[PDB]
Structures are given as structure tokens and as C-alpha cells.
Amino acid sequence: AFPKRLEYGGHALVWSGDWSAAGARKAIAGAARAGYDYIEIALLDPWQIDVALTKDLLQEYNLRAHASLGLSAATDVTSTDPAIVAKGDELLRKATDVLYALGGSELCGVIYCALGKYPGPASRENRANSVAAMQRLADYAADKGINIDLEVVNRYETNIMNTGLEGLAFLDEVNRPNAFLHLDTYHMNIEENGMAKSVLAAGDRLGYVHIGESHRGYLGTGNVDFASFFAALKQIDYRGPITFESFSSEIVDPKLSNTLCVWRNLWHDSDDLAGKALEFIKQRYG
Amino acid sequence: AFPKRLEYGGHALVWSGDWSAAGARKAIAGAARAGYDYIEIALLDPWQIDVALTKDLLQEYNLRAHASLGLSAATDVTSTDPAIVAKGDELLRKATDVLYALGGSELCGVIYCALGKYPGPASRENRANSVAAMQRLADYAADKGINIDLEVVNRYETNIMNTGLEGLAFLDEVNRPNAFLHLDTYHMNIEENGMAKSVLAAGDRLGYVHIGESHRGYLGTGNVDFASFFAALKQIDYRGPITFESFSSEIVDPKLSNTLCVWRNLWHDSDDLAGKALEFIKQRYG
Ligand SMILES: [Mn+2]
Ligand SMILES: [Mn+2]
């Protein structure tokens, strides 16, 4: 395990739909302006990012970076197609390399399967292929001082693990010291038996947190029991990354936004949303 | 509007994954055993129902029947392909005919689009095509004393309407006296700004209700603010069908279950689930 600290991050797609030179400056300036400790960069295509320019931007705005991504059908490490697993391994190493290059310590999100709506349930071979891939990734990450955090997402985004309890079981099969559980209030709101059970069960195994409202808009305008969730984090004295995650048709990444079915505009003012989000969070945890 | 009354029902998939002679009896017996007033039949293929056998089963167990369905890509009434919209019209009239033969009064569910994940947001033409299809269905249903209830579902299941407010606007465009809004607490838990706003807004336009827990499992083991929702229903003095809807890998309809991403086993004992659900509901609304 590599060092974790209580720090507050904003997801790139709060500010930018793409990670062009401009997009990168806008998001990084955005997060720094709002008072975030770090930006979480979406690395669905880790070859299109200008790492040197991004590194300069992080220096310029005195801001840290972690990275999240979701694999695609072409890079699905659950695939019983060895070629498709190899493409996944290759993308996760590239993502790890980019993250290392930016002085990052956390690779999180849906890194263990294709992000999206599977047409049917996962076979044991799908899960087995997933476990073996996170072992290979954890071993590669470990050489570069990087922790991986597997994000438990709802039934429409993965067939592998939809609850923290399922994630902890999968993690025990992975059995790597730098592999952790990643919980997201948005996904918890759908799948979990209250907002506390998975956090209490995780303890030190919880390595990353996403704060998202039930509809993924303004914090406090949805159904998520944040009082419950933040109570649970306190009970295990959680000290790791907490990134605000939000999606509106206002800022769209052609792939990720349609994958996440972001059909409505829940906000327009990135700075208002991000500023209010960090306030909301620090009021209830810190 | 055709007569509505405050009556309690269970969704077929609580007991049975198919509507074979055996599956129909199992669902109807299950509903009757728990003390439900009606069974809600999933009619995704209305041609496969043995209507006489089902009619005999309802008589035998002294149970009423309502019908819910989702369209598929092949029958999507939002399609810009006129042949696909005509297929939709044809299926919805077969569903209506079936319901009519069972002496039914409510065709509800995702009757206005293909149930599932859309690759992108709905155009005005998609919505216009939908409204016109629901107008044609409503006029056909009216001749057979059948109301249609438009079920608002989360972003992963439709790109047409994701909140009650959006559903009410769609509903006003349809402008038919036997057309109503259908709310489902499972979908509400995701998309809605609290559990009261859409219900207070709907008043007499709310024609049909589904009771689903946040994870579609045991009522009261999830995140759904039922106390808020039932307080809202009381405010508008709702007197219509209330269906307990639940999905577990324990009982699989090969199509519906996978379309709804039912990866997890949230129950095994249909009778225990269904019995506790009705009690839970009648305790909070009666
Ligand atoms: Mn997330
Ligand atoms: Mn429903």
C-alpha cells in the first residue's frame, strides 16, 4: 500500500468534456479556483493526453492529480477472448504510466470490466479473468508507487460487483496490498442496504470515495443519505481521496456521457456546482 | 378515464419468469396466497399468452389482472423508422386485446419507447413519434375500456422521460382522457428531487404506482424514503393500482431480467418477499 491522505478532488467532466490543451487548462484552473486539492482525470483513452502539458498545468495551478477510467468492449479484461484481455492490460499499463508521469498515486473507477450495460450476467470465467487482470495491474502499479481502487458501480454499468460487500469478496480473491475498494454514493444509492454497511465492512480496504447525488446533479437536491454516508466514513475514520463527480448535458464527453446516459442538464455553471459541492462535503466531513 | 380503485398487486416476476400454463398459475396462486387484489402480467410478447387458461386461472383464484410491458428495438414507437413504429402500434394493440379478454382496465409500464439503454439523447422527432403512438394506443384502448399509464423510468431504461414532471409534460402533449402518469419508487429514488414533488404535481394525473426498494429487493432494506412518498400519495388521496415490483436472479425472465440488469439474488422465498411487501405497504397506505 502507498500513502493515502484525506484530500478533496473534482472529476474532470465537472469542467471539461475532452482533455485537449485548452480542456486541461480549463478543468485544472476550475478545480484550483474552487479550492480542490486535486483533479481526477478521465483516462478512457490514455494515449490522447499530452502528459508534459498536463504536468506543467498541475505545477502552474499547484494542483495534484489522480486518474479514473472505464474500459470498453475492446479492452474488457473480463472477456473470455484472450486478445481483448491483452488490449485491457495494455490500456491499464498506459493509464498507470500517465498517472505516474503526473506524480499521481491513485488509479480508480471501473478498471476491472467494460463500463456500460452488459446484455447478461457474468460467468465465473468473467470474474476469474477480472481478478487475474487486477492482480497483473496491481503488480505493475506497485513498481510506480500507485494504488488501484476498484469502483463498485450499479447494475447498468457492471455485472461484476454492484455492492461494497461484493467488491470486498472480489478484492480478497485479487489479494494485493495496493488494491482497494472504491465507493460512489450515486451507485450506493441504487444497490446498497443503507449507506453504512459497505463502509463499515471495508474499514482500511476503502481506498477511494466518489461523492455523487442520486441524479448526479447538485449535492443536496437528490435522495442520497449523505448524513448516513459521512457518519459511516467517520466510524472507520476514512482518510483518502474524496472526489465530487457530476454529469450534465452542459459538458459532454462524446463517449463517457452517452455511456453514462446523461440525457438532461442538471447544471450549467461548473464553478457554482464545484464550489457548492466542496462546501457541502467539507461541512459534513473534515 | 375508466374506473380506478385503491387496489394492491404484485408483479409476475416476484413468482414466475415465464407465462406458461405452469408459470401463470404459479404467479396468480402466489399473488392470491399473499392476499393481493391483482397480478400484474409482464406482456413483452403478448402473442405467447394462452388467454383462456389465464382467464380460468384469475376466476379460479378470484384475482384481477393488469398488464405492464416494455417495447424493444423492433417495436420502438420513438423510432424515426416508420416500419418499426408500426410494429410498436401492432404489439400495443395485441397487449390491449389480451388485457381486454382478461377483463383488464390498466395497460402500464414503458409502453412509449424501447425499454433499455439508448446510445444517445432523444430528438424532438423521437418524442413527437412517441406522443403520436401513445395517442393512437389511447384511442384504441378507450374502445376496450382500458386506461394507459406512462411509467417514468431512470436514464438507463429510457431517454424520453426520467422524472414525474417530464412524464406529466409528455402526458399533457398526448392529451387523452384515459392516459395517465405511472410512478415507480425504484426509478424515483434515482432521478427525483425528493419523493413528493412529482406526486403533488400529478394529482389526478397519477393513474398507477409501483412500489420498488432502491435495489428492487425486500421493502425497507434499501434507501427509498417510503414515508415521504406515501405522505405525498395521501396529500393527493391517490386511489389507483399499487404494485409491489421486485427482481432477483432467483426468478429470471430471460429477456426482461437481463434488460433490467438483475445480476444479484436479493431474495429466494417469493411468498416471504411478497407477504412482507404487502404488509409493509398496507401499514403505510390503506
Ligand atoms: Mn464515480
Ligand atoms: Mn416499475
From Swiss-Prot, chains A, B:
UniProt-listed Enzyme Commission number(s): 5.1.3.31
Keyword Isomerase listed: yes
UniProt binding sites for D-allulose: H11, S68, E151, E157, H187, H210, R216, E245
Cofactors that this protein relies on: Mn(2+)
Superkingdom, natural source: Bacteria
Keywords attached to this entry: Carbohydrate metabolism, Isomerase, Manganese, Metal-binding
Active-site positions on this chain: E151 (proton donor/acceptor), E245 (proton donor/acceptor)
Amino-acid positions noted as binding D-fructose in the UniProt annotation, renumbered to this chain: H11, S68, E151, E157, H187, H210, R216, E245
Binding locations of Mn(2+): E151, D184, H210, E245
Gene3D superfamilies reported in the protein's UniProt record: Divalent-metal-dependent TIM barrel enzymes
Catalytic activity, reaction form: L-ribulose = L-xylulose; D-ribulose = D-xylulose; D-allulose = keto-D-fructose; keto-L-tagatose = keto-L-sorbose
Matches recorded under InterPro entries: IolE/XylAMocC-like, Xyl_isomerase-like_sf, Xyl_isomerase-like_TIM-brl
Entry keyword Manganese: yes
Top class in the EC scheme: isomerase
Family: Belongs to the hyi family.
Record text on subunit structure and interactions: Homodimer.
Role description: Catalyzes the epimerization of various ketoses at the C(3) position. Exhibits the highest enzymatic activity toward L-ribulose, followed by D-ribulose, D-allulose and D-fructose. Shows lower activity with L-xylulose, L-tagatose, D-xylulose, D-tagatose, L-sorbose, D-sorbose, and weak activity with L-allulose and L-fructose.
Domain remark text: Contains a unique short C-terminal alpha-helix compared to the known structures of the structurally similar homotetrameric L-ribulose 3-epimerases and D-allulose 3-epimerases. The length of the C-terminal alpha-helix was thought to be involved in tetramerization and increasing stability, however, the addition of residues to MetLRE at the C terminus does not lead to tetramer formation.
Protein name in UniProt: L-ribulose 3-epimerase
Taxonomic source organism: Methylomonas sp. (strain DH-1)
